Design a protein around this ligand. Structure first.
Ligand code: U05
Lengths: 398, 521
């Protein structure tokens, strides 16, 4: 049909990302998948004159013996020109469902001159074979340009439904489609199933409950008798929280700490100390006022391993100015748990601010890079960096 | 020239073709060049060009290594500079262990077949050169220029396209590409193998690729990149340890390198003592006398290298089993085998990630390296056998802040087993003396000792205090400190470190019955 012209950001050039090694099973899947795609004119093999590259992966569908190709267009997207805002109401909805409409992009062809940039490669085992090279002919799944270009086509397909069911909220993000409503689950699932048929009419799983999302506040130990050690930790924890909630006072507590007392010694709290603690709890009872989301700022996410399958994350833009804080329990091994945690958070950031957060993961790169795909099921890949969690921060959460 | 689809070449954006002046040459050379050039035009490799072409590239005559006859050479450096980047691929070498056992392998010298592969029609003009008149003769390339940027990549792809059909109808054969060589293998009977080789040899000839007649061909084992490849076994090529009297610094380094190369198959190869010889080396020419330990290490290594060991090839039918052993502090030997104690590859791990660590964490890291390694060579993870107990693992695991995971493994009782020498108390010790450290300490029992260092760094002081605390306390100690640094380090339960102080502290920790470290502002 008509290939809308798309370019890179001024001066910028196509991506040249190295393909992370892959298990045979993964490769065979990507071989199978890409093959049928080549037959269908969706992708074509490329020659050595295409020096560009983007990593590809093979993940597993949610409850289905099928693999889904996952191209990591992150770098490309960051180099692609700029081009639906965000239903604030969505985060209030009782039930939201996510659908993978990525397949729609395959009906629209990508601007011939841009195609070379979507060059990806199926890696070979032990560098024995040159490797299979391909480039997209149509709008590629995962590319930021795809949703934008398919926006017009999409909107047209969305109004016989939107205006026929104004009670439904449909938000698109990359290859996903967030459909929220307040119909009791029985009805909700039906409306979803119906939208699917409605979509099939034009040739085109995960279910959330945002209304139930709550922010995990900073807590303090409530105990019978307080020991010197407990008081030390109480003070230390407060001293940290005082930077966010400056109304926190430690004075009276530190007084109880006067003298090199035995760590295990029980120290009765003076009324002034009891009350000071009482106040500190009240202050901590709610998130610091003034935390306002800024669209022009990156959404940062930090996670901490609490052990036994428990995890704590905080979404903020400016340090300590957390837009959200949440907890996570196993639903497994650290990596799996992590990947699930990451995905969950991302999904939330999307529903909330309509953007993906940048993660700071408590794990080694080689470890993550090796196993993350083994548990990943999302259609997008959030940005991530690896760090070393300071023992103090952990003790200050949960 | 060959009937293959030409690969479209283009110059890097906004750039013009090479306009480099031909640097004058000898008449005798000019004569030679004209002779070789005409020969090529006859073969359609190059064709004369008219004054229309303003591009030029320097050509010169050189004699082949050890022989008396001219050779034409073109300095495509500038054109290379101007040529677009090609997907030149990765610079990764396929480790032999990932190759399967073949009853027959044949290598074909695919050197000059380069010249058989055509050059992009609209690009040819850029490859212009000129042999000066002692009525000038201007030429350009019609095929892939030797020494040109896109020659290797384009050749590789073209080669793959040519082989693809043959590979398709002959899935019993295995043709593997690698530079100017074409390694071919199969489990076919010798006689039939020779035929397939001929069928392939001529399959290339059909496309125009000049190949070597089986008569004048290289015979196994193949000396391939430091290795020695037999159709059913491999090993590193003859590694001979010099029997010197005086060892130069450079020499020790060369030696150490060789030794490491062997470690990938030869178990027990150690270089620690040799490495030590390098401490304070003022010159690559300096001579360092071997220490008795180094003498022993060199001799021992020498012995191991005196019995031609051989690595096994990969068998997709058998599982990959990886085993790990602690060779020394920080050194971990490992070997991956398929059939009971008959490895495809072996290796060592010493990568100390961090200034302070513990065996468990180090073992983990070793496991990861291997896992990565296995996926690279065999595209699959090996079932690990580890000298650690599920318990010990689980303990450190659940309590460490960093997330981690180890692929399917089984405990193996082959000491030394990796363990945790000391564990800090989760709650303060009742009846244990309390030490308030900041360089000196004060205890709840009045005891206080404060002194002054002389070289210490702010952070070094903090640990000195805790060390003191440990040193003067009883079996159970409660230590309070403000240094999140020392605290964190000690909370990491390190058993080894680069700083002598930390190790001393670790020693103390190991000797204590109960230790509880506490942090305060
Ligand atoms: C023909 C395959 N061949 C082989 C393959 C290879 N590769 O894939 O990178 C590299 C070298 C190589 N050579 C030289 C062999 O002799 C060999 C030996 C055993 C099995 N395949 C061998």
């Amino acid at each position: 049909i008509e290939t809308v012209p798309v370019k890179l950001k001024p001066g910028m050039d196509g991506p040249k990302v190295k393909q992370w090694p892959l298990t045979e099973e993964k490769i065979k899947a990507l071989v199978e998948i890409c093959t049928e795609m080549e037959k269908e004119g969706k992708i074509s093999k490329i020659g050595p004159e295409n020096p560009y590259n983007t990593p590809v992966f093979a993940i597993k569908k949610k409850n289905s013996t099928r693999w889904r190709k996952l191209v990591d267009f992150r770098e490309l997207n960051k180099r692609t020109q700029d081009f639906i805002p965000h239903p604030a109401g969505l985060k209030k909805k009782k039930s939201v469902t996510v659908l993978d409409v990525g397949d729609a992009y395959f009906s629209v062809p990508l601007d011939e001159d841009f195609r070379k940039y979507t060059a990806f490669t199926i890696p070979s085992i032990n560098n024995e074979t040159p490797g299979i090279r391909y480039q997209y002919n149509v709008l590629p799944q995962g590319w930021k340009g795809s949703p934008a270009i398919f926006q017009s086509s999409m909107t047209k397909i969305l109004e016989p439904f939107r205006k026929q069911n104004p009670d439904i909220v449909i938000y698109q993000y990359m290859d996903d489609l967030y459909v929220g409503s307040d119909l009791e689950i029985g009805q909700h699932r039906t409306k979803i199933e119906e939208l699917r048929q409605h979509l099939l009419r034009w040739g085109l799983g995960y279910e959330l409950h945002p209304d139930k999302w709550t922010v995990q506040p900073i807590v303090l130990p409530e105990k019978d008798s307080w020991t010197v050690n407990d008081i030390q930790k109480l003070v230390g924890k407060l001293n940290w929280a005082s930077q966010i909630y400056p109304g926190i006072k430690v004075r009276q507590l530190c007084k109880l700490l006067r003298g090199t007392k035995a760590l295990t010694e029980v120290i009765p709290l003076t009324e002034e100390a009891e009350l000071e603690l009482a106040e500190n709890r009240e202050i901590l009872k709610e998130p610091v006022h003034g935390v306002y989301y800024d669209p022009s700022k990156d959404l940062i996410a930090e996670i901490q391993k609490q052990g036994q399958g428990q995890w704590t994350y905080q979404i903020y833009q400016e340090p300590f100015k957390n837009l959200k804080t949440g907890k996570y329990a196993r639903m497994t091994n650290d990596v799996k748990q992590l990947t699930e945690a990451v995905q969950k958070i991302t999904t939330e950031s999307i529903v909330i601010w309509g953007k993906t957060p940048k993660f700071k993961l408590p794990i080694q790169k080689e470890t993550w890079e090796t196993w993350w795909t083994e548990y990943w099921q999302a259609t997008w890949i959030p940005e991530w960096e690896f760090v070393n969690t300071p023992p103090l921060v952990k003790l200050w959460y949960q | 020239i060959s009937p293959i689809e030409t690969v479209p070449v283009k110059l890097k954006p906004g750039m013009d073709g090479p306009k480099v002046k031909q640097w004058p040459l000898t008449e005798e050379k000019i004569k030679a060049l004209v002779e070789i050039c005409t020969e090529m035009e006859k073969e359609g490799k190059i064709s004369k060009i008219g004054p229309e072409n303003p591009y030029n590239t320097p050509v010169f005559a050189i004699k082949k290594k050890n022989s008396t006859r001219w050779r034409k050479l073109v300095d495509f450096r500038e054109l290379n500079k101007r040529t677009q980047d090609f997907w030149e691929v990765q610079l990764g070498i396929p480790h032999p262990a990932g190759l399967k056992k073949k009853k027959s392998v044949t290598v074909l010298d695919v050197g000059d077949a380069y010249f058989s592969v055509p050059l992009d029609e609209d690009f040819r003009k850029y490859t212009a050169f000129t042999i000066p008149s002692i009525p000038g003769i201007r030429y350009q390339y019609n095929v892939l220029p030797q020494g040109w940027k896109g020659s290797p990549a384009i050749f590789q792809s073209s080669m793959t396209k040519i082989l693809e059909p043959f590979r398709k109808q002959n899935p019993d054969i295995v043709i593997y590409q690698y530079m100017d060589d074409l390694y071919v293998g199969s489990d076919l009977e010798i006689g039939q193998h020779r035929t397939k080789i001929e069928e392939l040899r001529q399959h290339l000839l059909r496309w125009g690729l000049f190949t070597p007649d089986q008569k004048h061909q290289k015979e196994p084992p193949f000396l391939w990149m430091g290795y020695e490849l037999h159709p059913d076994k491999w090993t590193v090529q003859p590694i001979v340890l010099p029997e010197k009297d005086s060892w130069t610094v450079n020499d020790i380094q060369k030696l150490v390198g060789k030794l490491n190369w062997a470690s990938q198959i030869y178990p027990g190869i150690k270089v620690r003592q040799l490495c030590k010889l390098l401490r304070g080396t003022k010159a690559l020419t300096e001579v360092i006398p071997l220490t008795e330990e180094a003498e022993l290490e060199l001799a021992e290594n020498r012995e191991i290298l005196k019995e031609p060991v051989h690595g096994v090839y990969y068998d997709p039918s058998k599982d990959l089993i990886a085993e790990i052993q602690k060779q020394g502090q920080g050194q971990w030997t490992y070997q991956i085998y398929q059939e009971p104690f008959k490895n495809l590859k072996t290796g060592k791990y010493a990568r100390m990630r961090g200034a302070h660590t513990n065996d468990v964490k180090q073992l983990t890291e070793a496991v990861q390296k291997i896992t990565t390694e296995s996926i690279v060579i065999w595209g699959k993870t090996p079932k690990f056998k580890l000298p650690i107990q599920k318990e010990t693992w689980e303990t450190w695991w659940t309590e460490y802040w960093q997330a981690t995971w180890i692929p399917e493994w089984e405990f193996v009782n082959t000491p030394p087993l990796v363990k945790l020498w000391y564990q800090l108390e989760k709650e303060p010790i009742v009846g244990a003396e309390t030490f308030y450290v900041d360089a000196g300490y004060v205890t709840n029992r009045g005891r206080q000792k404060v002194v002054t260092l002389t070289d210490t760094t702010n952070q070094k002081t903090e640990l000195q205090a805790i060390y003191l605390a440990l040193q003067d306390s009883g079996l159970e100690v409660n230590i309070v400190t403000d240094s999140q640094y020392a605290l964190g380090i000690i909370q990491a339960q390190p058993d080894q470190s680069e700083s002598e102080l930390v190790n001393q502290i670790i020693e103390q920790l190991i000797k204590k019955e109960k230790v509880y470290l506490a942090w305060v502002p």
